[PDB]
DNA sequence: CGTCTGCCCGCTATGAGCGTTGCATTTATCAGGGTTCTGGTCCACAGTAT
């Protein structure tokens, strides 16, 4: 191939290949896939791609992009490289250099949940004004696809249409403005959008790349934040006024809406577990519910770097 | 085997009376005195003895080849075997030319009045089918290679064309597929009459449905009497398919193709037909015969079929 | 291939006066006739009990091929089939020229791929279906085959050209495949016509929606009077989303092409029609009918037993020879005439001529060991156990 | 094939297999040309077809249709044999059975009769209606399909489909476009209409097997009328009444339709040929228009017999 | 004005390009097993009541 496009500002891979094959009259996806790839056993994936290094051989003449750049600046990758560790990191880039596609999911673990959900392809309609109107094209954004937000950290709700990504597997689909618009009000929560910019930043910040805490660090920055704050009883939770201050945070429709209902009855909850001593990774969502709820005036980088440091 | 041409002998029984497929064949044999020719033995006992050791290792070394002996076991399974032959070929009686004059007259007498009721032809509905199981080593092919050397193979008719098969014999695989029963069904076809049916059927890539519908308009061509499926066993879920399809392509096959089906396996091999009533219904059609190796006595006094075996 | 030419009767329906293929058929049975014409038996002889061994040993194995002895329901059945094959051709007149706008409508179906289009909006459909469910064993082939000898299949006219085709039985595939079922319909309709229309249409490269109209058009240029599909339980073993489209298909043709379809299946197909026609059930028969022996059981096994070729043989049945022969059996059909052969099989054998109980139970216990669960769980009466397993009574 | 449908009345063997190849359910024309004859090279013959063997092969079982009731029932033959002469009438009947089909059109000039055929389909809007309600098909007919007058002899004139047999030479074509129906009331004439009426009764006429006249037959018989009309002169002809009653028969503007247009500057006219020698076979239309201007007191079944007496 | 000289002319054989066909290959479907993964479960220990 001899004219790969250079991928723009804040936009996956994905979007990449598929503009690949509308800039050259390529319609049918297998010839597609035997021309960029040269296989037609690839699975296209949005978020956490595969078979990467190909790509970069493309783009070798333009010195910039190279496969950390397209790992850590086009994917999702930096939104699970601090909370992981240290330790399955360096196995996950490794791994996304080659051919190995689910092994990725796997040792990314918090991501090896077996069925995922929600594959409808998302947008936002508001900046795709802003998309044709600087570029000339429309493309998908990372925004958008949060791996459980769907909203815009700076518009509101996304609006999606009924397609899926495993709905043909070796497709690559690109957006088109004449099928785009279908823009129609929908409700809003003011809550889930401060939780969507407040978690924005993370993705272009060059600190998640080389610091990364352990589990032993979790608990510890845990437990220190727990006995200087105040509400905790011997060596234990007060069980009620961290749920309170949660519940003051955040109403029980975005908890409910986020998959992370607050169970205060059984022993099991996810809050019970982020306090007890870590066993395994937990995702985004539920670290950045803790920090808001516990540290009401800190940014996400610099409560990470106080995490690590220490 | 080879093209014997037939000479027909008439038979005793009422229902065998006007058929050349059941005439050109061996004469009726009472079951006692049937089960007595089935005896062999080596000659040389006392001649032979004095010579050089090599010779004589050789010559015994063919003692399991050559020594066979009945028991009182060998009768019920000969009769069965003469029956289910000659009884599989009265609904396939070729010499018949008065059929159109006599069906016209019939619906002329029952459309103007005279006569009130009727029958022009009617189909047939399945053929007999039988089972025979017996733990390893205790002679299920050694004992029906000699039961089958009774009958010739191939019979040719003269005033017909028809080459009458009279038996045919095929095994099952270790892989258990579906796909090669009706593939050895052609080649030993084709290793006896010296034919090219593999090429012409096999080879070209056809669906087991279409290749079983296939098997039933060769059998039929050549009047074949008897077909022989050993080592049933190996069917045991080995490979090829679900248990159902497994189940379903024998019952398909009983209910197709024209002539008897016999099954030999082991005693492992029930589980398989022991599922639904079906499957129990055409196992043991005709039948199912068990059987058991030899014991020292039956009631205190030790066994005479023990003391023939093992002085002979 | 009966092929046999045509005379017109005289019927005294207003609705058959001038029909052709109608006028045809043989004239319709009574109900005192038409058992009495199904009725058949071996016909044995005076001299044939005094002969050698095995030519009588030669003569019991005939017993199974060569008996039948209609029950109730056989007449009920025969009926209902006379009234589903007379009554379908109404629609179907070539003198007034109905069957030949039939035609017409099913050329587009072939053209199009859609079976729900039409030309003529007078062309009407008058068929009816059928189902039929029974245990293994009750008699659902045997039976059809019986019920269908009376008419002559093919039927050639001479004021037309064309070859009436009175009946028709295939079966379903085992592997539950679609292509199949459309192939097996061309093989027994180039069986007994003996043309080629496989070669025609099985070998050509086309897809289910056009052999399914080519199927539906070459039943209806032959004026094919009924079709019958043996073992319908086949379909639920085939590919997910495939079942339900024959199920429809089946009940288009009759709602729109206008040939009559009839079904048979064990109580297994139940799960695939009910989860998704008129419905006739069978069962085995019982002694008990309300508080008194049912006269049917009794007037089969008599009718069973004066087919004895035992040279020392009991005058009359005996009331515990009955009760162990319906104790092993069960009342189902198949059972009791091989138990009837085997057990006089091995009286021949042994030397005493005569059956008893104690022969009964030997020849059950010894010769019939892989049909003992089945008739165990049902002799149990236990209905979760008579629920177990697959293809027993409902 | 195995069942083959008999024809209808009146009706040509393309509209049979046409409904024949419909019946079945064969849409590719190779496999229906596979299917009724044995190759795949015969052509689609409109009017006058070959092959007639096999066709009569396949209706065997029947008693009524046999080669020679197909010659002449559902053929235009008919107005053919009785004015092409006894030997190569014998020798067409003969010959277009069995496998010819440029023998028979070359033998009879057929081809050469006409250098452009009519090969656009026909149409009768009355005629289908009777169809529809009598029979419930719609058929070719031989009353449509004149060599060269489009005129209907019961009602009017003919619609065209515009469609035409040539462009497909291995397709048989069916009339089944829901009965396309359209007014085109205009007409030329009705002697016209009065010639096709009496022209339609030569085609289903049981004499009309035996009756062929020869050359010199013919031309003594033409000096007979001449004689009995008196309108000859010594060793001459009158050249001028002959002209004037064919005027006051047929109009000019309605034989401009036949294309057959008298011209009495130049001496290559028919109507001085029909009356001098014949040498070369004439069409029936220039024997009928002679007819119906000096003879109308015959029809045409009696007017060939008194010119056979 | 008719047969020979020109004229017509239907016919025939040939080759390059386009449209169609049968076989082998790829692709899809389904059952079985399995092997680590993680998700809830019970046991022993620290701190509190008589
Ligand atoms: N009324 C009857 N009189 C005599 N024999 C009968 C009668 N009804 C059934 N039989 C016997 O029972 C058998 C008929 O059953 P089949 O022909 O195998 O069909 P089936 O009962 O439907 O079993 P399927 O098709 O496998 S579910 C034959 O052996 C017949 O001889
Ligand atoms: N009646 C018999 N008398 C002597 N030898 C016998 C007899 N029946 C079987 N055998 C011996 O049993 C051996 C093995 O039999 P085989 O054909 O392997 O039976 P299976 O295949 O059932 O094991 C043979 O070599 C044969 O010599
Ligand atoms: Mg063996
Ligand atoms: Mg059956
Ligand atoms: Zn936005
Ligand atoms: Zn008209």
Not at chain 1, 11 to 28: C, D, F
Not at chain 3, 105 to 123: D, K
Request: hydrophobic share 40%.
């Amino acid at each position: 191939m001899r004219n790969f496009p250079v991928p723009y500002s804040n936009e996956l891979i994905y979007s990449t290949i598929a503009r690949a094959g509308v800039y050259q009259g390529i319609v049918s996806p297998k010839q597609l896939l035997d021309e960029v790839y040269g296989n037609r056993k690839v699975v296209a994936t949005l978020g956490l791609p595969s078979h990467l290094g190909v790509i970069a051989r493309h783009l070798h003449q333009t010195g910039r992009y190279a496969v950390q750049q397209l790992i850590y600046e086009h994917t999702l990758f930096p939104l699970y490289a601090p909370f992981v560790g240290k330790e399955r990191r360096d196995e996950a880039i490794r791994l996304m250099e080659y051919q190995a596609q689910g092994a990725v999911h796997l040792m990314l673990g918090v991501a090896a949940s077996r069925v995922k959900s929600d594959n409808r392809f998302r947008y936002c309609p508001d900046c795709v004004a802003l998309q044709l109107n600087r570029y000339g094209e429309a493309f998908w954004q990372r925004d958008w696809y949060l791996p459980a937000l769907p909203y815009c950290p700076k518009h509101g709700a996304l609006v999606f249409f009924d397609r899926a990504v495993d709905d043909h597997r070796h497709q690559f689909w690109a957006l088109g403005h004449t099928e785009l618009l279908s823009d129609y009000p929908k409700d809003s929560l003011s809550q889930l959008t401060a939780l969507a910019a407040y978690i924005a930043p993370l993705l272009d910040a060059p600190r998640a790349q080389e610091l990364s805490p352990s589990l032993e660090q979790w608990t510890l920055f845990y437990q220190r934040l727990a006995q200087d704050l105040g509400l905790t009883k011997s060596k234990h939770i007060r069980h009620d006024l961290v749920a309170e201050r949660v519940r003051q945070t955040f109403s029980d429709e975005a908890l409910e809406k986020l998959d992370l209902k607050l169970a205060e009855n059984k022993d099991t909850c996810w809050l019970k577990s982020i306090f007890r001593k870590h066993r395994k990774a937990f995702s985004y969502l539920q670290h950045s519910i803790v920090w808001q709820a516990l540290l009401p005036k800190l940014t996400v980088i610099e409560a990470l770097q106080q995490a690590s440091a220490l | 085997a080879t093209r014997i041409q037939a000479v027909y002998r008439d038979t005793g029984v009422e229902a065998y009376r006007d058929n050349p497929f059941i005439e050109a064949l061996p004469p009726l044999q009472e079951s006692v005195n049937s089960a007595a020719s089935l005896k062999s033995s080596l000659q040389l006992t006392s001649s032979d003895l004095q010579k050089s050791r090599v010779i004589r290792a050789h010559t015994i070394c063919r003692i399991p080849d050559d020594y066979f002996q009945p028991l009182g076991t060998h009768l019920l399974l000969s009769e069965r075997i003469s029956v289910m032959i000659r009884g599989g070929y009265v609904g396939r009686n070729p010499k018949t030319g008065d059929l159109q004059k006599h069906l016209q007259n019939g619906y002329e007498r029952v459309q103007t009045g005279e006569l009130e009721t009727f029958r022009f032809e009617e189909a047939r509905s399945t053929a007999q089918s039988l089972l025979l199981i017996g733990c390893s080593g205790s002679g299920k092919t050694t004992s029906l290679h000699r039961i089958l050397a009774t009958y010739p193979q191939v019979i040719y008719h003269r005033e017909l064309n028809v080459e009458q098969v009279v038996y045919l014999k095929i095994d099952c695989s270790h892989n258990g597929s579906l796909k090669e029963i009706c593939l050895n069904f052609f080649r030993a076809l084709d290793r006896a009459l010296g034919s090219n049916y593999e090429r012409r059927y096999g080879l070209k890539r056809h669906g087991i449905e279409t290749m079983l519908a296939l098997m039933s308009q060769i059998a039929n061509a050549h009047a074949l009497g008897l077909l022989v499926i050993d080592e049933i066993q190996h069917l045991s879920r080995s490979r090829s398919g679900g248990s159902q399809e497994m189940l379903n392509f024998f019952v398909t096959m009983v209910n197709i193709i024209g002539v008897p089906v016999m099954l030999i396996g082991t005693p492992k091999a029930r589980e398989i037909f022991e599922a639904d009533l079906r499957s129990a219904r055409r196992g043991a059609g005709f039948g199912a015969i068990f059987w058991d190796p030899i014991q020292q006595t039956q009631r205190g006094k030790p066994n005479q079929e023990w003391i023939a075996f093992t002085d002979n | 291939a009966t092929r046999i030419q045509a005379v017109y009767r005289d019927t005294g329906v207003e609705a058959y006066r001038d029909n052709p293929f109608i006028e045809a058929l043989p004239p319709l049975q009574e109900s005192v006739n038409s058992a009495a014409s199904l009725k058949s038996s071996l016909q044995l002889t005076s001299s044939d009990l005094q002969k050698s061994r095995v030519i009588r040993a030669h003569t019991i194995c005939r017993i199974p091929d060569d008996y039948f002895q209609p029950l109730g329901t056989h007449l009920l059945l025969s009926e209902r089939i006379s009234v589903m094959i007379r009554g379908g051709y109404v629609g179907r007149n070539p003198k007034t020229g109905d069957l030949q706008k039939h035609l017409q409508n099913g050329y587009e179906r072939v053209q199009t791929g859609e079976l729900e289009t039409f030309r003529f909006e007078e062309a009407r459909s008058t068929a009816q279906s059928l189902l039929l469910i029974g245990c293994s064993g009750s008699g659902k082939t045997t039976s059809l085959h019986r019920i269908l000898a009376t008419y002559p299949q093919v039927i050639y006219h001479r004021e037309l050209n064309v070859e009436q085709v009175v009946y028709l039985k295939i079966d379903c595939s085992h592997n539950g495949s679609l292509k199949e079922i459309c192939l097996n319909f061309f093989r027994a309709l180039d069986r007994a016509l003996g043309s080629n229309y496989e070669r025609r249409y099985g070998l050509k490269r086309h897809g289910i929606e056009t052999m399914l109209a080519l199927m539906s058009q070459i039943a209806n240029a032959h004026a094919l009077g009924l079709l019958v599909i043996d073992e319908i339980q086949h379909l639920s073993r085939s590919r997910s989303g495939g079942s339900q489209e024959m199920l429809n298909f089946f009940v288009t043709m009759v709602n729109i092409i206008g040939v009559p379809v009839m079904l048979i299946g064990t109580p297994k197909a139940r799960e695939i029609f009910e989860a998704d026609f008129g419905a006739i059930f069978w069962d085995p028969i019982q002694q008990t009918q309300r508080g008194k022996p049912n006269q049917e059981w009794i007037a089969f096994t008599d009718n069973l037993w004066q087919l004895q070729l035992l040279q020392r043989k009991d005058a009359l049945l005996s009331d515990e020879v009955r009760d162990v022969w319906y104790e092993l059996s069960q009342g189902v059909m198949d059972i009791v005439v091989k138990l009837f052969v085997l057990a006089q099989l091995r009286a021949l054998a042994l030397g005493n001529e005569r059956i008893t109980a104690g022969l009964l139970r030997q020849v059950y216990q010894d010769e019939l060991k892989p049909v003992h669960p089945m008739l165990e769980a049902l002799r149990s009466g236990i209905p979760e156990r008579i629920a177990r397993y697959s293809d027993l009574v409902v």
